[PDB]
Structure formats: C-alpha cells, structure tokens
Design an enzyme around this catalytic site. Structure first.
Site, PDB file in Angstrom:
ATOM      1  CG  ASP A  35      21.035   1.055 -30.256  1.00  0.00           C
ATOM      2  OD1 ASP A  35      20.806   1.813 -31.212  1.00  0.00           O
ATOM      3  OD2 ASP A  35      20.245   0.893 -29.292  1.00  0.00           O
ATOM      4  CB  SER A 199      17.978  15.350 -43.533  1.00  0.00           C
ATOM      5  OG  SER A 199      17.857  15.187 -44.929  1.00  0.00           O
TER       6      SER A 199
END
Length: 330
Positions: A35, A199
């Site tokens: 994770d 992004s």
C-alpha cells in the site's frame, strides 16, 4: 541488493493485490497488500481477537527465533475506506522477493475491523508511503522500503500491476524490459506523507486533451481512480445511461455499455486507461447496473490515482533524497 516479488489480484475484479512476504525465523509467509498510501506493516497474528479472524494466515511471533517485542509500542490506523486495525509491535526479519530487512517493525493486530475479517485473502498490509505517516507510538517506525533503502542498488521500488493478471513489485532496480517507450518522471511532494504529484490533464476516449493540473496520490492500496467531480462527470457523460447513485455510492452504468478509455497526463506524456479497466461489474450479483472504476474524490479531500490508473502503467517510486515518480506505458 534487490528484491522482486509477484503480486496477484485477490479476485476477478482486481479489488486489491497480494504479495507474499516472509516474516520471522523459520519464515512465516503471509500475503500482504502493498500500500503506497500508508506506512504501517501490520499483520493478522496469534494476538488477533479470535472472532475477527476468518481464514487469514497469521503471524505467530512466539514461533520466530528472531522476533522481539518492541516494548511499550502500540499502533492504531484508520484508512480512507473507514476500515481500521490496532495492536502492539514486534521487530523481526522480513523478506520480500529475496530482499531481507532485519529489525523491521511488524505490527501485530489485536483488533481489525469487519472489512479485514471478511477478506480472507489479505493477511495484512505493507505500507510504502513515507515513514512520517507510520502510526507506531511512542516511537515512530520506518517502512520496509525506508529500512531497505541504503542496501538497495538504487533507492527505488516499482509497481507493475496487472489487469486481471499477476504483476510485479521490484525493489532496488528498474526492469527496462517491463515497459515500452521511456519513463516520464514528475515531482513529488512529501508534505502529507504520500507519493503526491500533479497530473497535467486528461482526455475521455478519443476526445481532445484538457490541460489542467490535478494534484493527487499514487496509491496502490486504493482500488479505484478518484478525481474531481468535473472530470468524473465529463467521463460518465460519454456513457449512455450512466448516472451517479447516492444509494449505491457512486457512478453506475448499464452493464451493456462499452466504456471509453481515460487518459491522464504525466508531464508531456500520456497514460491511457482502457475502457475495460473501468468496469467493476454488477453492483450486486445478477444486476444489470455495473459499478464504475472512476469516481468523484469530492468529500475525500484528495484525488487518488489508485489501481485503475496505476495498472495501466509501469510506475517508479523514486526514493532518492528528492523523491520523484515515474510513469511509462507497457
């Protein structure tokens, strides 16, 4: 040193991925959920409340000659999906894919929430976010990666998740045969303890690319792609009959649909998520309403590039002094 381990989907929807991890001496092999959105290595154990164990493999520290109680240390964690666990701590030898760390903090669960109990395939979590998020008190502990880093050939790990198929976590090297083209690297902020990046935008299907900054985290422990409501609405508007359902808890779509792809930007590069990756199947057995793999992050407080996005790429988690993230197509 390096390590290389195969990671395998737990079910037919790729809800999560498990990776075998060797703990203790002699080795006890547990299948952990790696994770990158958390920083605790915790396991089901001989100390876990019996009624809260249902099929998991447990770590038994008393059977390990290298286990030592970390006296006074406790831990307690809550995840974004509302699940939780807590317990005490041992140090022991932990190996992943041939890479061994001695003195790793192994957090032994005394209590786990129902979602953990109900998932027999996940024996615990191995956190790969920054150690500043580790919950051990009063002495915070380091992640497996942080402990391994100095011994690694290069201070990196990579995630290569499969779509309906096994993939690979590598430590200490970049497998140049595992991706196509070049890797595009992008800046990371560690301010919140995550692999947080921005992004450069998105496209829906064959549509034009929208240049827009989307701050979010690269999180292997989250199944879906969670993005701003504007972006998600633009995606689902291209699917006839798709709608957001408060009763179901997100966007659903007719199972008869063909889903468009979704593209996200990494600098000037582009990662394309095929439409099929966005299908999470019937909302309940036999339903003709299917659950979407792109959902709104509104009310989470952060955008999350979870498995839906990451499995479309070869992803480099660069833990150099100035960390960065790399994405390649594959």
């Amino acid at each position: 040193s390096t390590g290389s381990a195969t990671t395998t989907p737990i079910d037919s929807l790729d809800d999560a991925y498990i990776t075998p991890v060797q703990i203790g001496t002699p080795a006890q092999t547990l299948n952990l959920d790696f994770d990158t959105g958390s920083s605790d290595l915790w396991v089901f154990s001989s100390e876990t409340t019996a009624s809260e164990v249902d099929g998991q493999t447990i770590y038994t520290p008393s059977k390990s000659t290298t286990a030592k109680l970390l006296s006074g240390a406790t831990w307690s964690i809550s995840y974004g999906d509302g699940s939780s666990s807590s317990g005490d701590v041992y140090t022991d030898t932990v190996s992943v894919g041939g890479l061994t760390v001695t003195g790793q903090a192994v957090e032994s669960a005394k209590k786990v929430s129902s979602s953990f109990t109900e998932d027999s395939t996940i024996d615990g979590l191995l956190g790969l976010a920054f150690s500043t998020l580790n919950t051990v008190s009063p002495t915070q502990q380091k992640t497996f990666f942080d402990n391994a880093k100095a011994s690694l050939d290069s201070p990196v790990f990579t995630a290569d998740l499969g779509y309906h198929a096994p993939g690979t976590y590598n430590f200490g090297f970049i497998d140049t045969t595992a991706y196509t083209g070049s890797i595009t690297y992008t800046a990371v902020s560690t301010k919140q303890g995550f692999w947080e990046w921005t992004s450069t935008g998105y496209a829906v299907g064959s549509g034009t690319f929208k240049s827009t900054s989307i701050d979010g985290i690269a999180d292997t422990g989250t199944t879906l792609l969670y993005l701003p409501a504007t972006v998600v609405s633009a995606y689902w508007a291209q699917v006839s009959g798709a709608k957001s359902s408060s009763s179901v808890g997100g966007y659903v779509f007719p199972c008869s649909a063909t889903l468009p792809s979704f593209t996200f930007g990494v600098g000037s590069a582009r990662i394309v998520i095929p439409g099929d990756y966005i299908d999470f199947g019937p909302i309940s057995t036999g339903s003709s309403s299917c659950f979407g793999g792109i959902q709104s992050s509104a009310g989470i407080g952060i955008n999350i590039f979870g498995d839906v996005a990451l499995k479309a790429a070869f992803v480099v988690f660069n833990g150099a002094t100035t960390p960065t993230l790399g994405f390649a197509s594959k």
